[PDB]
C-alpha cells in the first residue's frame, strides 16, 4: 500500500533478524523509510512489537540546543548571550534534529527515560532503560562509563532504518577504547544542574567526536566510523533488507566494536 503499516514494519524488523527480548539502537530516516500509518510514532510501535515488552529500544538524542561549538576548545563563549541559554531539562528539550525525528517519539514512549549528558543525551526505553541512561556525565559521553559502554555490554545490536553506516554511534565506543596514540580530545561546557542551586556551567575533556585521528578528520572524506563500518561490511556477518522502503542494517555491537578495536590497532597502532 501506499503507507506502510504498524504489522508491515514490524514482518520487516523480524525478517531483519530482530528478535524479542532483544536490545536496539535505533539510528533512522524516516524519510527513508517512507510513509506508514500514523507516523513515527507507529515506527516506535513497530519497534516495539518486534522486540516485546522484555527488549530494550535506544536512541541517540543528544540536544536541539547544545552549546557544543560554542564554547568548544576554549572558544571565548561570547557572553552577549547573558546566559539565557535554556537549561536541558530531560522532558522537555529537543533532541538534535540530525539524529532523526524518532528519537522525539522514543522519548514519548511509555516508561522511556532520558539520560542526563545533555550535548549526549541517550533515550532508551525497556528493562534496561535507567541501566542505560545513568550515570552520563561530563568526559563519559560516548566511551567508558558511557551508556555505550553498558550498551556494548548487554550484547546490543544497532539497527540502521535508511541511515548511512557514519550513523554507527557505538563505533565511537571503540574509538574510546583503542589502545592506539594520539587519539585526538576536545574540550567544551554545558549547563548541568548540581546541587540544585539551577544551572552550573561545568566543563568536559573528551574524544573528538569528528575525527579520532587527524585523517579521519578531514571534510569531505570518511571518518573512522564510516571506514570501520564498510570494512566490517565485507565479512558477511551483520544483515541487510529493507524496513518500509529503506535500505537498512542489523549489527551485532559487540562484534563491530571489537572488530573495530582490531582494525584501529592493526591500522594505526604503529605510532
Ligand atoms: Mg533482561
Redesign the pocket.
Known amino acids: 500500500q501506499g503507507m506502510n503499516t504498524i504489522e508491515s514494519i514490524t514482518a520487516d524488523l523480524h525478517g531483519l533478524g530482530v528478535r524479542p527480548?532483544d536490545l536496539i539502537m535505533v539510528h533512522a530516516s524516516l524519510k527513508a523509510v517512507g510513509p506508514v500509518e500514523g507516523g513515527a510514532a507507529s515506527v516506535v510501535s513497530a519497534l516495539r512489537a518486534a522486540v516485546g515488552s522484555?527488549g530494550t529500544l535506544m536512541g541517540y538524542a543528544s540536544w536541539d540546543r547544545s552549546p557544543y561549538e560554542e564554547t568548544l576548545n576554549g572558544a571565548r563563549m561570547d557572553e552577549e548571550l547573558r546566559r539565557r541559554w535554556p537549561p536541558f531539562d530531560l522532558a522537555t528539550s529537543g533532541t538534535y534534529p540530525g539524529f532523526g525525528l524518532l528519537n522525539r517519539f522514543l522519548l514519548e514512549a511509555p516508561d522511556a527515560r532520558r539520560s542526563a549528558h545533555p550535548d549526549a543525551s541517550m533515550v532508551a526505553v525497556g528493562?534496561?532503560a535507567a541501566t542505560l541512561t545513568e550515570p552520563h556525565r561530563l568526559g563519559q559521553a560516548l566511551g567508558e562509563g558511557s551508556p555505550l559502554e553498558r550498551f556494548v555490554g548487554h550484547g546490543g545490536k544497532v539497527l540502521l532504518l535508511g541511515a548511512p553506516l557514519d550513523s554507527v554511534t557505538v563505533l565511537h565506543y571503540a574509538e574510546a577504547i583503542a589502545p592506539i596514540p594520539n587519539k585526538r580530545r576536545v574540550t567544551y561546557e554545558m549547563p548541568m544542574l548540581g546541587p540544585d542551586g539551577r544551572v552550573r556551567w561545568e566543563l568536559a575533556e573528551d574524544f573528538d567526536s569528528n575525527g579520532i585521528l587527524d585523517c579521519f578528520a578531514v571534510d569531505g572524506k570518511p571518518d573512522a566510523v564510516e571506514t570501520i563500518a564498510k570494512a566490517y561490511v565485507e565479512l558477511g556477518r551483520h544483515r541487510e533488507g529493507i524496513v518500509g522502503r529503506a535500505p537498512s542494517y542489523l549489527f551485532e555491537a559487540q562484534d563491530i566494536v571489537s572488530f573495530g578495536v582490531t582494525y584501529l590497532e592493526q591500522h594505526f597502532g604503529a605510532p
Open positions: 527480548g522484555a528493562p534496561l
